Design a protein around this nucleic acid. Structure first.
Length: 113
RNA sequence: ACUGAAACUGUAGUAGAACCAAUCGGGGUCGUCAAUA
């Protein structure tokens, strides 16, 4: 079954991605913006460039170019685990412990973590 | 009731000036799944 409320309704309109040039937040101004739900874009005021590795033997190959380490499983994030991803208010407090699972994503006055 | 003749619609003139194919984005990461009896 479904939680009562969609996560987009638990995030404030002042925190959603910007949709107007008049509502560009600090990081939208510094790093730039393109409107995903309309017209509008801004070139970033910050540019990263000239990334130079200073060390030459910087890459560990673990003995041979044909060796590899198998990494631990990197699973998909599962926001449906409300106790981890839902907040008990808009200021980002965790859900209270002990409550029924139905109590995540339940109230408009709840929030995202 | 005696055809005029002969005469290059040519000569000069740059389809061009201006305009960034561009703006935003870490190749990233964890909780189950399934519905009967």
């Amino acid at each position: 079954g479904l939680y009562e409320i969609a996560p987009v309704d638990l995030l404030d309109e002042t925190l959603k991605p910007a949709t107007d040039k008049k509502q560009l937040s600090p990081a939208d101004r510094v790093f730039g913006w393109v409107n995903q739900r309309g017209n509008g874009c801004y070139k970033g005021q910050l540019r990263i460039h000239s990334v130079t590795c200073q060390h030459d033997d910087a890459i560990d190959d673990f003995g041979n170019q044909n060796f590899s380490v198998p990494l631990a499983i990197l699973g998909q994030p599962k926001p449906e685990q409300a106790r981890f991803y839902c907040a008990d208010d808009r200021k980002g407090i965790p859900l209270e412990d002990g409550y029924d699972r139905d109590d995540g994503y339940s109230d408009s006055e709840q929030g995202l973590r």
